[PDB]
Structure 1
Amino acid sequence: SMQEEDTFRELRIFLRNVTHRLAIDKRFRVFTKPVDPDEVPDYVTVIKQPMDLSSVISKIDLHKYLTVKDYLRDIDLICSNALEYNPDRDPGDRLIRHRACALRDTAYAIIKEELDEDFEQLCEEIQESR
């Protein structure tokens, strides 16, 4: 219905606002663009499911997220890909991992303060009903 379409439009508006606030954080610049295949050849071979904030924006716009749960799966993938590809003890890898965990914690904390649980629950019930 029109009412359900209004619900998903509000969700996309919410998800773009949260994603924008992550993307302008200087700590998360590395997560704003896909890994450039030129600069990093073995990324696409090692990370099976690349994800970054530019892809999250594209997915919002293609209506790929019907719930904040589904969006947070992609935030969690940006973090787990970073931990997976940069696992070493050296400062380079420890910095990326620290940033990856801060992106995940910041997204979860924004949503905890600003997502109405009844709004999420409506999104889940419309999604389940399809």
Structure 2
Amino acid sequence: SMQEEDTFRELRIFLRNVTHRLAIDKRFRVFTKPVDEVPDYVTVIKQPMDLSSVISKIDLHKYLTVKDYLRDIDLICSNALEYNPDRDPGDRLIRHRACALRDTAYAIIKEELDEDFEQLCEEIQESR
């Protein structure tokens, strides 16, 4: 219905704003674009994810719930932890930023998304 289309549009507006706030944070610059510089990334990481790809998926109407969105934020983080497992400072820096990206996204949603709004999104989606 029109009421349901309005609900998903509000979700997209919310998700674009959260993603923009993550993307302009200097700590998260490494997560803003997809990974020639890294020859072994394409074979190690089966499902690359980054914040520019997340924005594209919002605009393609691929997220109908905040859980769908957070699954892709979690994938950005989990990819980073798996590709950077060593004790070297370069690896530890990216792991710290990846965990901060995940923690920041969850904290923004916890503080700013009404749980009744997320519940409405789920109930529309489970009906489809």
TM bin (shorter chain): over 0.9
* TM-score normalised by the chain length of structure 1: 0.98
Q: Does the residue aligned with 2:49 lie in a helix, a strand or coil?
A: coil
Which aligned runs of 4 or more in structure 1 are off by greater than 4 angstroms? none
Once the two structures are TM-superposed, the CA of residue 41 in structure 1 deviates from its matched residue by: 1.1
In the TM superposition, what whole-angstrom CA distance separates every residue of 1:79-113 from its partner, at most 9, and x where no partner exists?
Answer: 00000000000000000000000000000000000
Once the two structures are TM-superposed, the CA of residue 48 in structure 1 deviates from its matched residue by: 0.4
| Distance in 2, Cα, partners of 1:126 & 1:41 | 42
Q: Can you give the 5+ residue segments of structure 2 that lack an aligned partner in the other structure?
A: none
* TM-score normalised by the chain length of structure 2: 1.00
* Cross-structure match for 1:33: 33
Once the two structures are TM-superposed, the CA of residue 44 in structure 1 deviates from its matched residue by: 1.0
Q: Does the residue aligned with 1:44 lie in a helix, a strand or coil?
A: helix
In the TM superposition, what whole-angstrom CA distance separates every residue of 1:19-62 from its partner, at most 9, and x where no partner exists?
Answer: 00000000000000000xx1011111000000000000000000
Paired residues, number: 128
RMSD of Structure 2 on Structure 1 (CA): 0.3
Q: Does the residue aligned with 1:122 lie in a helix, a strand or coil?
A: helix
Percent identity of the aligned residues? 100
Q: Can you give the 5+ residue segments of structure 1 that lack an aligned partner in the other structure?
A: none
